[PDB]
Each structure stands twice: as structure tokens, then as C-alpha cells.
Amino acid sequence: LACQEITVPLCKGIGYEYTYMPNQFNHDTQDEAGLEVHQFWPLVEIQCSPDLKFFLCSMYTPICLEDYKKPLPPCRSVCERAKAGCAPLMRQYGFAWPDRMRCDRLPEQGNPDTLCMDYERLEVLFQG
Ligand SMILES: NC(=O)N1c2ccccc2C=Cc2ccccc21
């Protein structure tokens, strides 16, 4: 609802400055979100996907903008790239791709009414 400076260490400097609560992971605060997203640090560090960190942050500390007041998700493609790189390694060690991160419930780019986010390199790109 109101924008707050991102305070999750993993997500600081990710390409956007502000987040909001609640997220879609049943977190009311960044402290709660930070405790869950920190558990992914080994996968971030092993670099199974250059997109994993941006994807994680875009979900757990979603972007907050002053001039767009609708939830703004990562585009489905960001999720698909992160999943393609990292889900096989995750399965090998007994971890499923989390249901809340199912890429098919994220919107595709080009939507007439709403936006979604990708990035280049780190600069956010809105593609809608
Ligand atoms: N909070 C939301 O409604 N969205 C949306 C919005 C439109 C479509 C799917 C989704 C799914 C989850 C999600 C994740 C991050 C940021 C926003 C967000």
C-alpha cells in the first residue's frame, strides 16, 4: 500500500528502491519476507540462474511505485528463466519449485491493461 525502502539484504540494490507489504507469501513485514527469502542464498551464490535473485526479490519484496498503484509482478518469462536454470539442481537435492512461484499464474508481457517487470544489465524494464 505505502512504499517503503527495501531493507532485505538480498534485495538491496536490485534495480528498484521501494517495496510494499503484504506480499503474496503471507508476509506483513519485510522482516518476515527477509527470513524466508534468505533461505535461497546458496542457490543465488551457486548462480544456477542469473535471473534468480531478481525473480526472488520481485516476488518477496515486490516493486512499489509512486505513480502506479496496482500490484506489479515480474513477467512470466523472468520466472521461466529462473526456474529453467535452478529447478533441476533444486530437485536433485530434494526441493520442489515452490507452488507460489508457479510461472503460469504470472502474466505475460504486452498486457493491454497492466504492466509486468523484467530487467536488463541492472535496469528494470516495464513490459506490461
Ligand atoms: N500481488 C499480485 O496480485 N501480483 C500479481 C498481479 C498480476 C498477476 C499476477 C500476480 C501474482 C503475484 C505477484 C507477485 C509480485 C508482485 C505482484 C503480484
Curated annotation (Swiss-Prot):
Receptor for Wnt proteins. Component of the Wnt-Fzd-LRP5-LRP6 complex that triggers beta-catenin signaling through inducing aggregation of receptor-ligand complexes into ribosome-sized signalosomes. The beta-catenin canonical signaling pathway leads to the activation of disheveled proteins, inhibition of GSK-3 kinase, nuclear accumulation of beta-catenin and activation of Wnt target genes. The chain holds residues 33 to 151 of 685 of the full protein. The gene is Fzd8. Hexadecanoate binds at residues 39-46. This is Frizzled-8. Belongs to the G-protein coupled receptor Fz/Smo family. Glycans are attached at residue 17. It is found in: Membrane; Golgi apparatus; Cell membrane. Ubiquitinated by ZNRF3, leading to its degradation by the proteasome. Residues 1-119 form the FZ domain.
